[PDB]
Design a protein around this nucleic acid. Structure first.
Ligand code: GTP
Ligand code: GTP
Ligand code: MG
Ligand code: MG
Ligand code: ZN
Ligand code: ZN
Lengths: 145, 136, 65, 100, 99, 96, 249, 263, 131, 244
RNA sequence: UGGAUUAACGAGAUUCCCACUGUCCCUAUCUA
């Protein structure tokens, strides 16, 4: 009766009030968070060709995935590669502050040495990292002859 | 956890809640199993305890050797049939859920396990890595 | 350890180098710690303490008589 | 770091893409994506689906038995990491791609 | 007991069979172990014994061991190099082979 | 009457009120404190969040299960062109 | 159990047992009831008090019963050992006293609760509560001597060693001051007295030693004087029962 | 809840009738209640009625009484609403017992025993109408009740009791009908028990059954003959086991056990 | 995604991956072994009367007698016709281990397939002789 | 030279180590205590290799090899294949296998002259083992127990089988092997014998709680300590029949 | 001791097994 996606007993007899901790409905999202201790994997130069290449991949490719990021253009300037997620959606301005103390966790002292940077398409289930690869795999098409 | 599980076990998906009926994998004679509690579970209001691959549960033979019933024995899952994520990224999964019977320290009841066995489970328990023939 | 092992130990090695000046001072200070526990120790630990000390003083008066 | 060919799509599947199913016969079927995973599940024929290399390479489309296509055997004798050998390999691999 | 003697006859009676052919079989002892002098826990002139390395570097859960640095190539200089492992596609190792 | 079965509270009360932020540029509220003998150095930097991709890195994490093994995991890409200085501002400490 | 029982909790003396169990029923039960509540609620309050106190005593006792090594019908060597040690008679009769007391307090609770379900006022039920609890209290206050005995038997038998009756043994015996313990200390890793006086030990001391990769236990005994088997000691009858039951060199 | 009504009828009864069943008196006595009765109220004398006698031939119908009458009345009597042999030994014994208390103005007497032994049936045969329900279901009557007959001998019955011992049985607990066979999830794991209890002749004569061994083969035989097959083709083992145990209880399979014989 | 495909081809409702089937059909001893199959009691027909091309236990002699003469079993008979799509098909259709592909298809086209077809013939004759 | 030790805190040395007369493979878990105990007596004579098979620590029961060469399972990656390759010298013909069953260490117990094999090994492998390992193969089963790898240790001196090996089957196996056999038992009564110890022509490493009786019997059959050549197995008959 | 123990049918009352499932673990998404 009268709703199921709610809370049944929002209060005891006494008090005759709803307490500030009963968790009612209202605006979700658009808050202002602060995650800490995100590791910086790669500081990508902006003039450089072959960013998305490592000491293993050694195939010349830039970090923009095929057809650019989604709802965002392509990468051209200097960038930061952070392990994990980060609050806020794409296109949004983020601030990066530095650590407020001296972290004593070996995850703060270790050296990262990447092996391969996925650059497939994010717009649909892509499978080739470069358009050169796509072409080599599919072979010629009706149009190019 | 459980005793005899060598090393720490990371988290993989939880495919077998309590009430599941998996298979018996070894040649101990048990034909299938029933899960009645999973050892090392958490504690959360309403959360059904659930078992993963490599976990040690408390099973009962629902049908099997006529001379094995009415008791509850420690079992160890070796297949899962719920896509868990290997670390070198690939979500793999198996064909059915199956486990083997072991005495609480971790030692096999039977003698040889038939069918592929999870690499994670075999790594965790060193007495499956000895009585198994097909490690995934 | 088979039998009276701590006693064999005490006779062979001894006690802490200061187990005597700690016991002595503990004793001399118990006289102070009795009144502290009587002016603190609210709420039924104070009742148990008072009844116990009454028992003790009664027994000592019995004994000296 | 061992790029695999989808068992159905024959595409490449890079580390972190697709699903793998392990049969009780211990054969690991890798899949490029869910399209091919679900078609496998429904038991269709990758040699009768028109869009897949199994059908093409042996249905009259792009050639198969080629002198370029004999350098990609799975090596099971791993010798020695010679640096000049790696150098010649790196040249020859791009040479092969262009010729084929 | 007269049911345990026969039971332990298994481990008692162990066969020295007849070699069942003309071929020979010998223990292969390497020359490399002969000159090898046994190890001492006390004497200061004991081997370096990489436990000493991980202890003095060091830490039983912190020593980042060099899993390279002991393997046998032509020149050591490129023992601390990298295998490419991939190219524009088609993982390198599958094309790698002599000639 | 008391509660029969116990369960932790639903939600976190440190993050309240759950209301829209005051701006899109969320503000920094605390800065790495100081040291007047280090060389001058910025403590913050603002950029733009652009997508998220995947990575495989070899792990040198001694005493871990994935020591000397590869590991795949996600990364975010933030798009940070050079930032350019246009002003300075000085703050004095008052008993307020 | 067997082989150096050290798993027996602790026998708090009767005043301490009273304290422990009564304070516990005071702390781990609600203690505010008002004359105004429903007579059902009052009856329930005091019922719970009585039943809980009963359970607490009963577990305190059931622990001792299930703990002690049960002198008779264990193994003749140990049976006669705790005979010569802790007086078989007193042992059995004390533990029996404890079992009787356990039954008594179960009965006290199970009568007074059947009563309380007929109380008609806070005062009637409060009087029943005090009555049942006071009866349990005297029942336990009787147990002064058994518990004072059991504390020392526990702190003794815990220390008491563990010689398997059947593994390869080696008994060492003779007169005081001869060299029993000299031989033991000189043959196997132990700590047994060597000082130049008669009864340099007073109980059975053990020491293992290996031979043909196998385990052999050696047992030094205090010894025997002349003592024409009429007058002896708990010192001597230990060696007696040892040389009797244990079958080795 | 049950032992309450039990002592209610023990106390409101002027005498007690401890109904046994003919097929297993030594297992459905398990007294530990007569010890209490004799000592707390000695003036009630614990008549015995060995009900369902016909399932025990006249031979054992004599053997099982001959060595128990040396304790109590022990009138073995199979009950039936038209042909109840054994009633003409007790309908007048209890009545003379009623006359004995001629300064009571009445008498009230009560039935005790295991469930599914026949107490409601005995009321109904001594009254001649179903004033209480008869039911093969073990726990049919769940509350005591007074019943008027002869306007002097009031009758009462109580639900069945089981002296709570954690010993000596689970299988014979299931073999006495005290728990319904729809409340056990393992019904085929006791068919070996029935096949070790009862012998093979009447097993063969009942259904009849295929020539067989091996209670598991016995159950598959039962089911393939009865058409109790599920979705291909493994048949309804739970269902056939439940039927075999309903047979066992209701007495559609002969069974008994033998005491020291005729001396 | 809707209900038919999922509540039919679920991981609890699998068939037996006809590469295994074709393997089991190639070799005569496997044919005879899976054809005799000492009596078990769970499988619906109880062992006998079982189609080796499909993987199903027909209940009775008459049931299999009709099953063989149908469009389902004929569909699978034609499904099992050529090279059964090993993983090497999918890995050589991308220019990899093409030599292993060629050796395998050569064996099937020259050495194994003849015996396979001969054995399905003999098995048909045996099914008749029994039926 | 019967040098008991312990992987991190496990007695199953055979599932975390692989030992032979020319090299050793040890897992890379945790710390250099296990490997240091190995290098204590193995020293610098034979190459040791910190390694990993298919990204696990259980290597002794996934690989299988003798001094002629090594044989690694399918799911080993090419990177660690290359690591092993560089680590060992040229003689050890490392080679992958394509197989139905990965745990080769449990289905082939082998030494430098002959290798018993689980019954359902394939023919390609049945001849591939001859190709590289340099032996002759016989499909067998150690007293019913399939998986001959973890239920019969072996060296060039003698073999140790799990205690339930019947006498006649033991005679058949000893005829197959032309070398002695003893129905052994390790680690306070662990039937799995090959998976609780690793042994070769100059050494055997077994668990810690492997008691002195069992240590002594295997020492007598493997002729490690100087010198116990298989007659001391009959010398110590004054103990092994009393202990049972 | 001259009035007594049952197929079929059932929106009759209760208990159970198989199939099956978002009832639940533990929720998620779409349409009007
Ligand atoms: N010089 C010498 N003295 C010995 C020898 N054996 C025994 N003794 C003497 O015996 C003494 C040993 O005393 P214990 O071993 O304690 O004899 P005990 O007093 O009967 O020992 P307990 O029965 O355990 O109380 C030594 O101090 C020696 O004086 C021996 O071989 N050489
Ligand atoms: N063959 C035979 N069956 C009887 C006899 N007496 C009773 N029965 C049957 O057994 C069942 C026993 O149920 P009840 O009549 O209620 O007797 P009960 O043992 O007291 O059972 P409850 O009253 O439910 O506790 C009855 O339904 C009858 O169907 C008898 O004397 N012979
Ligand atoms: Mg002395
Ligand atoms: Mg009844
Ligand atoms: Zn497609
Ligand atoms: Zn068919």
């Amino acid at each position: 009766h009268r709703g199921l996606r709610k809370v049944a007993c929002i209060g005891a007899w006494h008090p005759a009030h709803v307490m500030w901790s009963v968790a009612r409905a209202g605006q979700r999202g658009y808050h202002s968070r602060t995650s800490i201790n995100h590791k910086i994997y790669r500081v990508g130069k902006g003039d450089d060709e072959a960013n998305g290449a490592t000491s293993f991949d050694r195939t010349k490719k830039t970090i923009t995935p095929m057809g650019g990021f989604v709802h965002y253009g392509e990468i051209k300037n200097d960038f930061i590669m952070v392990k994990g997620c980060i609050p806020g959606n794409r296109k949004r301005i983020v601030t990066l502050r530095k650590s407020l103390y001296t972290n004593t966790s070996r995850k703060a002292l270790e050296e990262v040495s990447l092996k391969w940077i996925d650059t497939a398409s994010k717009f649909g289930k892509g499978r080739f990292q470069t358009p050169a690869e796509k072409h080599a795999f599919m072979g010629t098409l009706k149009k190019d002859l | 956890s459980g005793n005899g599980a060598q090393g720490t076990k990371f988290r993989i998906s939880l495919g077998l809640p309590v009430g599941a009926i998996m298979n018996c994998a070894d040649n101990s004679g048990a034909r299938n199993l029933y899960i009645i509690a999973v050892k090392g579970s958490g504690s959360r209001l309403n959360r059904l305890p659930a078992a993963s691959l490599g976990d040690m549960v408390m099973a009962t033979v629902k049908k099997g050797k006529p001379e094995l019933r009415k008791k509850v024995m420690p079992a160890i899952v070796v297949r899962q049939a719920k896509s868990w994520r290997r670390r070198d990224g690939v979500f793999l999964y198996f064909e059915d859920n199956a486990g083997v019977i072991a005495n609480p320290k971790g030692e096999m009841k039977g003698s040889a396990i038939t069918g592929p066995v999870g690499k994670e489970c075999a790594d965790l328990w060193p007495r499956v890595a000895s009585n198994s023939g097909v490690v995934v | 350890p088979q039998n009276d092992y701590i006693e064999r130990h005490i006779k062979q090695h001894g006690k802490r180098l200061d187990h005597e000046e700690r016991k002595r001072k503990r004793e001399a200070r118990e006289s102070h710690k009795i009144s502290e526990r009587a002016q603190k120790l609210t709420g039924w630990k104070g009742k148990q303490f008072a009844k116990k000390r009454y028992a003790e003083k009664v027994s000592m008066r019995k004994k000296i008589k | 770091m061992r790029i695999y060919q989808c068992h159905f799509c024959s595409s490449p599947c890079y580390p972190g893409h697709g699903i793998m199913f392990v049969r009780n016969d211990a054969k690991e079927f890798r899949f490029c994506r869910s399209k091919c995973h679900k078609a496998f599940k429904q038991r269709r024929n990758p040699r009768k689906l028109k869009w897949t290399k199994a059908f093409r390479k042996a249905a009259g489309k792009e050639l198969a038995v080629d002198s370029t296509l004999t350098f990609a055997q799975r090596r099971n004798v791993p010798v020695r990491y010679n640096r000049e050998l790696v150098a010649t390999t790196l040249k020859a691999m791009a040479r092969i791609e262009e010729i084929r | 007991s007269q049911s345990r003697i026969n039971n332990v006859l298994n481990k008692i009676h162990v066969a020295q069979p007849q070699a069942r052919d003309d071929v020979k079989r010998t223990p292969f002892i390497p020359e490399s172990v002969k000159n090898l002098k046994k190890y001492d826990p006390e004497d200061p002139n004991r081997r370096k014994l990489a436990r000493d390395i991980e202890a003095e570097n060091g830490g039983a859960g912190v020593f980042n061991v060099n899993l390279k640095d002991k393997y046998l190539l032509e020149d050591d200089e490129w023992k601390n190099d990298i295998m490419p492992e991939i190219l524009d596609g088609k993982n390198v190792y599958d094309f790698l082979d002599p000639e | 009457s008391h509660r029969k079965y116990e369960a932790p509270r639903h939600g976190h009360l440190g993050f309240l009120p759950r209301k829209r932020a005051a701006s899109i540029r969320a503000r920094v509220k605390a800065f790495p404190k100081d040291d007047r003998s280090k060389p001058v150095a910025l403590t913050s930097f603002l950029g733009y969040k652009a997508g998220m991709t995947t990575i495989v890195r070899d792990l040198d994490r001694p005493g871990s299960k994935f020591h000397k093994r590869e590991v795949v995991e996600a990364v975010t890409v933030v798009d940070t062109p050079p930032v350019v200085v246009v002003g300075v501002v000085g703050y004095v400490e008052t008993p307020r | 159990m067997q082989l150096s029982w050290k798993d027996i909790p602790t026998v708090a003396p009767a005043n301490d047992l009273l304290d422990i169990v009564l304070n516990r029923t005071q702390r781990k039960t609600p203690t505010v009831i008002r004359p105004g509540f429903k007579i059902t609620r009052i009856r329930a309050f005091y019922m719970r008090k009585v039943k809980y106190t009963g359970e607490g005593f009963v577990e305190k006792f059931e622990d001792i019963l299930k703990g002690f090594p049960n002198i008779n019908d264990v193994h003749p060597f140990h049976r006669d050992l705790m005979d010569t040690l802790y007086e078989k008679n007193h042992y059995k009769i004390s533990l029996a006293a404890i079992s009787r007391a356990k039954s008594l307090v179960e009965q006290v609770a199970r009568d007074y609760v059947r009563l309380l379900k007929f109380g008609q006022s806070l005062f009637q039920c409060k009087q029943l509560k005090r009555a049942a609890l006071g009866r349990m209290a005297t029942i336990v206050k009787k147990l002064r001597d058994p518990l004072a005995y059991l504390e020392q038997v526990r702190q003794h038998i815990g220390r008491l060693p563990s010689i398997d009756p059947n593994t390869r043994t080696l008994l060492i015996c003779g007169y005081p001051n001869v060299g029993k313990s000299s031989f033991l200390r000189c043959i196997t890793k132990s700590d047994v007295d060597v000082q130049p006086y008669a009864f340099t030990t007073k109980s059975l001391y053990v020491g293992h030693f290996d031979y043909k990769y196998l385990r052999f236990q050696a047992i030094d005994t205090p010894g025997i004087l002349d003592r024409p088997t009429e007058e002896m000691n708990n010192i001597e009858m230990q060696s007696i029962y040892a040389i009797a039951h244990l079958r080795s060199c | 809840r049950i032992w309450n009504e039990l002592y209610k009828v023990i106390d409101s009864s002027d005498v007690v009738i401890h109904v046994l069943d003919a097929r297993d008196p030594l297992g459905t006595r398990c007294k530990s209640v007569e010890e209490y009765m004799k000592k707390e109220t000695p003036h009630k004398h614990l008549i015995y009625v060995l009900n369902k006698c016909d399932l025990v031939p006249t031979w054992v119908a004599a053997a099982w009484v001959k060595h128990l009458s040396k304790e109590r009345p022990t009138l073995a009597f199979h009950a039936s609403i038209t042909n109840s042999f054994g009633k003409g030994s007790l309908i007048q014994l209890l009545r003379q017992f009623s006359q004995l208390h001629t300064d009571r103005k009445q008498i009230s007497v009560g039935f005790i025993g295991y469930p599914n032994t026949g107490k409601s049936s005995i009321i109904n045969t001594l009254r001649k109408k179903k004033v209480c329900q008869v039911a093969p279901i073990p726990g049919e009557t769940k509350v005591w009740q007074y019943i008027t007959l002869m306007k002097r001998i009031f009758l009462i019955d109580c639900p069945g009791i089981v002296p709570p011992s954690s010993k000596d049985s689970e299988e014979d607990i299931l073999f006495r009908g005290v728990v319904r066979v729809e409340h056990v999830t393992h019904p085929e794991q006791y068919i070996p028990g029935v096949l070790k209890r009862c012998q093979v002749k009447h097993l063969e004569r009942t259904y009849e059954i295929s020539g067989w061994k091996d209670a598991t083969e016995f159950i598959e035989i039962l089911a393939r003959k009865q058409g109790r097959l599920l979705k291909g083709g493994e048949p309804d083992e739970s269902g056939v086991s439940k039927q075999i145990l309903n047979d066992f209880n209701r007495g559609k399979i002969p069974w008994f056990v033998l005491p020291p014989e005729k001396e | 995604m809707g209900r038919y495909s999922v509540k039919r081809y679920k991981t609890k409702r699998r068939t037996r991956d006809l590469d295994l089937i074709y393997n089991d059909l190639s070799t005569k001893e496997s044919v005879q072994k899976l054809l005799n199959q000492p009596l078990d009691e769970t499988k619906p027909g109880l062992g006998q009367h079982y189609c080796i091309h499909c993987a199903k236990y027909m209940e009775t002699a008459i049931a299999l007698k009709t099953h063989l003469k149908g469009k389902v079993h004929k569909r699978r008979v034609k499904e099992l016709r050529g090279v059964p799509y090993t993983q090497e098909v999918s890995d050589a259709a991308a220019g990899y281990n093409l030599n292993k592909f060629l050796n395998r298809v050569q064996e099937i086209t020259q050495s194994v397939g003849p015996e396979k077809e001969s054995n399905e013939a003999l098995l048909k004759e045996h099914l008749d002789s029994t039926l | 030279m019967a040098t008991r030790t312990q992987f991190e805190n496990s007695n199953e040395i055979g599932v975390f180590s692989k030992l032979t007369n020319t090299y050793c493979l040890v897992a890379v878990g945790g710390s250099e205590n296990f490997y240091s105990a190995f290098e204590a007596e193995l020293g610098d004579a034979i190459p040791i290799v910190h390694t990993t098979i298919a990204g696990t620590r259980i290597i002794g029961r996934m690989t299988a090899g003798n001094r002629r060469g090594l044989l690694v399972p399918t799911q080993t990656t090419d990177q660690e294949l290359q690591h092993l390759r560089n680590s060992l010298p040229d003689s050890v013909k490392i080679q992958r296998v394509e197989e139905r069953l990965s745990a080769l260490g449990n289905v082939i117990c082998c030494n430098d002259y002959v290798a018993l094999v689980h019954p359902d090994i394939d023919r390609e492998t049945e001849e591939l083992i001859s190709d590289v390992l340099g032996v002759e193969v016989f499909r067998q089963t150690i007293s019913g127990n399939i998986l001959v790898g973890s239920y019969c240790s072996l060296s060039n001196q003698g073999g140790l089988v799990h205690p339930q090996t019947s006498v006649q089957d033991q005679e058949e196996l000893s005829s197959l092997l032309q070398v002695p056999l003893v129905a052994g038992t390790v680690n306070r009564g662990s039937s799995v014998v090959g998976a609780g110890m690793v042994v070769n022509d100059y050494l055997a490493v077994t668990g810690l709680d492997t008691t002195a009786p069992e240590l002594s019997v295997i020492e007598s059959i493997f002729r490690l300590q100087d010198a116990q050549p298989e007659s001391i197995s009959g010398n110590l008959r004054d103990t092994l029949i009393e202990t049972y």
